Design a protein around this ligand. Structure first.
Ligand SMILES: *[C@@H]1O[C@H](CO[C@@H]2O[C@@H](C)[C@@H](O)[C@@H](O)[C@@H]2O)[C@@H](O[C@@H]2O[C@H](CO)[C@@H](O)[C@H](O)[C@H]2NC(C)=O)[C@H](O)[C@H]1NC(C)=O
Ligand SMILES: *[C@@H]1O[C@H](CO[C@@H]2O[C@@H](C)[C@@H](O)[C@@H](O)[C@@H]2O)[C@@H](O[C@@H]2O[C@H](CO)[C@@H](O)[C@H](O)[C@H]2NC(C)=O)[C@H](O)[C@H]1NC(C)=O
Ligand SMILES: *[C@@H]1O[C@H](CO)[C@@H](O[C@@H]2O[C@H](CO)[C@@H](O)[C@H](O)[C@H]2NC(C)=O)[C@H](O)[C@H]1NC(C)=O
Ligand SMILES: *[C@@H]1O[C@H](CO)[C@@H](O[C@@H]2O[C@H](CO)[C@@H](O)[C@H](O)[C@H]2NC(C)=O)[C@H](O)[C@H]1NC(C)=O
Ligand SMILES: *[C@@H]1O[C@H](CO)[C@@H](O[C@@H]2O[C@H](CO)[C@@H](O)[C@H](O)[C@H]2NC(C)=O)[C@H](O)[C@H]1NC(C)=O
Ligand SMILES: *[C@@H]1O[C@H](CO)[C@@H](O)[C@H](O)[C@H]1NC(C)=O
Ligand SMILES: *[C@@H]1O[C@H](CO)[C@@H](O)[C@H](O)[C@H]1NC(C)=O
Lengths: 41, 238, 314, 45
């Protein structure tokens, strides 16, 4: 039974950076991404 | 290359099915069409006159009496035209601002590599490709995004012989037993040597400086040849 | 962003007057354009407010203990002991920065002040616990001393200068952020732009709703008086005169609102660019993110705007 | 070897070519070692 629902906005998943004191995070891989951007001219 | 090919393959599915983008050009077209439609529909209003057709007023009235109705319709249509021209001028200013932005994006992302953050895509910008769309332009920002992160234990410098050895490029990391020197956007651990480190002062000022051994290839080769020379001298003597 | 307003044609011009409302029907779509223009302005205000701040995929959070290598961030990190999670500087800016009855309703912003404060806090936590890495994909944590070495190396200064001068640099930054709360409200200069926006909007609304007392050549400025004292056919002329005057007032208000909306959208695009470059990274553009060699910046939500705390090296 | 950095082996890059990479330290060490060997040979006989 689908209906209209009103809810508070979500600003994104709550993530807490594991900011240690003498620890650093370094990637071991990557991902090439091709985004898009459309501008009226 | 496989990643780029897969990404370019998905550009024809995440452009016309997820909505989001491609609504700005259609919005421009819709705004222009709606403004023109509203302007053309104002010819059916009376603005207080007796009819919205000038031929009817001309036919049914004497000139001196028809002057008033003609003037009323003139005032109404002139107001409508002024409103249309003002809205068009403001829209033209906005479109020109967008076109200046588009030319800047072309020059600084297609005709070169951009260090401006998030100007030419979410990530580290590699290149962009332009595409022509009706009354607009479309960019395909190729970006480099780090994916799989493993966090090590770091340190600002390495005090080997009472001297602080900072990294020439990259950061110091350790997996638990040994310390390496890796670049900053990719895990490529390298043995800490004097070639990729420079010394500035002792290890009494740097906070968090970590003891390790800084490998010296020159001294290693010198000791390797010195040991052989000493052995040869000892054999010659006795 | 500016204040979103909505206008009702009939209530403003010929409110509670059936004959006056009918006489307005002779102008056709002379005010559906006004309604559409104001709706576009309001939607664009929401777009500006979303585009400036919503630049983080996730809402980052600082660790429970606030130690960042000697740099004191207590004057920009969120303060839990408040109804809204706003920092000291954000609260000061909110405190310093301070008509409906004729078809003039004011729409509320899509993002509440609490949500803007959350966005600002997330951006700040990301920029202090993950460097610039959080603006280019996944956020990678890094000690703040090593991040300041990052930024020093980014402007032609070797990192050993920071590591050998961490104490002095930390004290200098703490003192410099200490003087912000005194160089923000007492010297005038800045902070007048948000107040000017608020004043311009309130003044425009008042001027538009003050035109109801003008005569424009009619006998009286009250519709009911003309209606009662005159027969319909003769009162038609005066009602048309008042309708023309009020329509001109509404069109002038809408035109100035559109021009101000364009100017504010230009400012909001500039603010989004400043956030993306100064905050989410280190900028090599001269004078773009402060007077000097830019190190790293902080956003602070303010009423109808944003405030940047540009740290520079001189 | 001063302006080139080594990374892995030659079976991974597409378009890698053969050429000698001059080593200053190796050349100087080889010259001095040859001189010392000649001196030792002269001393022995
Ligand atoms: C880092 O090491 C230095 C140097 O110590 C020398 O090298 C070590 C690897 C080990 O073999 C030591 O025994 C060597 O002496 C440390 O300096 C020493 O500090 C201790 C403790 O105060 C002192 O008793 C020694 O005399 C010092 N040695 C020298 C040569 O000055 C230094 O403390 C170590 N740093 C940390 C953080 O543990
Ligand atoms: C680049 O060189 C490799 C290695 O060749 C060896 O080292 C050279 C410096 C020289 O001394 C060669 O004679 C050595 O063989 C080449 O790989 C060789 O390819 C040949 C022909 O197929 C094969 O017989 C050898 O076994 C290969 N050697 C090895 C070590 O795998 C390679 O072909 C050269 N690249 C090009 C483009 O010619
Ligand atoms: C982070 O590392 C530093 C040292 O590199 C620590 O700084 C001091 O540490 C002692 C305990 O070793 C604390 O009692 C002091 O309060 C710290 N100094 C300051 C100015 O706060 C720091 O404690 C380390 N750990 C954490 C969790 O921050
Ligand atoms: C980096 O990521 C790429 C892409 O995700 C990985 O390549 C995949 O490797 C798996 C395992 O061999 C294959 O099944 C997939 O087909 C590969 N994907 C593509 C697109 O080729 C790669 O292994 C990762 N590299 C490292 C070092 O972790
Ligand atoms: C960071 O700044 C805060 C705010 O100024 C400092 O807290 C002040 O501490 C002094 C000394 O105890 C008190 O007199 C003030 O009342 C405090 N102010 C507030 C707003 O709480 C804090 O000490 C600073 N931290 C460091 C490490 O310098
Ligand atoms: C970073 O280390 C912490 C502590 O061990 C861990 O919780 C976290 O998952 C690590 N990060 C990643 C990306 O694995
Ligand atoms: C750390 O890396 C070194 C070098 O590869 C390896 O010899 C050592 O076993 C590693 N230590 C751990 C705990 O994985």
């Amino acid at each position: 039974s689908q209906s209209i629902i009103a809810y508070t906005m979500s600003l994104g998943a709550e993530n807490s950076v594991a900011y240690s004191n003498n620890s650093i995070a370094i990637p071991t891989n990557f991902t090439i991404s091709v985004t898009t951007e459309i501008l009226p001219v | 290359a496989n990643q780029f090919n897969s990404a370019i393959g998905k550009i024809q599915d995440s452009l016309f099915s997820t909505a989001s983008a491609l609504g700005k050009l259609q919005d421009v077209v819709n705004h222009n069409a709606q403004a023109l439609n509203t302007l053309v529909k104002q010819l059916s209003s009376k603005f207080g006159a007796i009819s919205s057709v000038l031929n009817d007023i001309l036919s049914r009235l004497d000139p001196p009496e028809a002057e008033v109705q003609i003037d009323r319709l003139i005032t109404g249509r002139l107001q409508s035209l002024q409103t249309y021209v003002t809205q068009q001028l403001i829209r033209a200013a906005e479109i020109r601002a967008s076109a200046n932005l588009a030319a800047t994006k072309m020059s600084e992302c297609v005709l070169g590599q951009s260090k401006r953050v998030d100007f030419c895509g979410k990530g580290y910008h590699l290149m962009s490709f332009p595409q022509s769309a009706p009354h607009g332009v479309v960019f395909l920002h190729v970006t480099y995004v780090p994916a799989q992160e493993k966090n090590f234990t770091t340190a600002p410098a390495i005090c080997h012989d009472g001297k602080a050895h900072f990294p020439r490029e990259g950061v110091f990391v350790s997996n638990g037993t040994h310390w390496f020197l890796t670049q900053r956007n990719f895990y490529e651990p390298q043995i800490i040597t004097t070639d990729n480190t420079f010394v500035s002062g002792n290890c009494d000022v740097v906070i968090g400086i970590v003891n390790n051994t800084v490998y010296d290839p020159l001294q290693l080769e010198l000791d390797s040849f010195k040991e052989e020379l000493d052995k040869y001298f000892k054999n010659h003597t006795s | 962003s500016m204040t979103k307003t909505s206008v009702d044609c009939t209530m403003y011009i010929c409110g509670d007057s059936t004959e006056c409302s009918n006489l307005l029907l002779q102008y056709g779509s002379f005010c559906t354009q006004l309604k559409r223009a104001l709706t576009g302005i309001a939607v664009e205000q929401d777009k500006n407010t979303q585009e400036v701040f919503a630049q983080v995929k996730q809402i980052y959070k600082t660790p429970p203990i606030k130690y960042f290598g000697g740099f004191n961030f207590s004057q920009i990190l969120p303060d839990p002991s408040k109804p809204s999670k706003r920092s000291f500087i954000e609260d000061l800016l909110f405190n310093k920065v301070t008509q409906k009855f004729n078809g003039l309703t004011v729409l509320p912003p899509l993002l509440t002040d609490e949500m803007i404060a959350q966005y600002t806090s997330a951006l700040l936590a990301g920029t202090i616990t993950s460097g610039w890495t959080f603006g280019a994909g996944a956020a990678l944590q890094i000690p703040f001393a090593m991040q300041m070495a990052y930024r020093f190396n980014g402007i032609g200064v070797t990192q050993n200068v920071l590591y050998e001068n961490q104490k002095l640099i930390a004290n200098q930054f703490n003192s410099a952020i200490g003087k912000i709360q005194d160089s923000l409200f007492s010297t005038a200069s800045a902070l007048g732009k948000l107040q000017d926006v608020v004043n311009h909007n309130a003044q425009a609304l008042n001027t538009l709703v003050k035109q109801l007392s003008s005569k424009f050549g009619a006998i009286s400025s009250v519709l009911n008086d003309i209606l009662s004292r005159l027969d319909p056919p003769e009162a038609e002329v005066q009602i048309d005169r008042l309708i023309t005057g009020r329509l001109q007032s509404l069109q002038t208000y809408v035109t100035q609102q559109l021009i101000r909306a364009a100017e504010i959208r230009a400012s909001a695009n500039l603010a989004a660019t400043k956030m993306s470059e100064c905050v989410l990274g280190q900028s090599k553009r001269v004078d773009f993110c402060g007077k000097g060699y830019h190190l790293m910046s902080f956003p602070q939500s303010a009423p109808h705007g944003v405030v940047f705390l540009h740290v520079t090296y001189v």
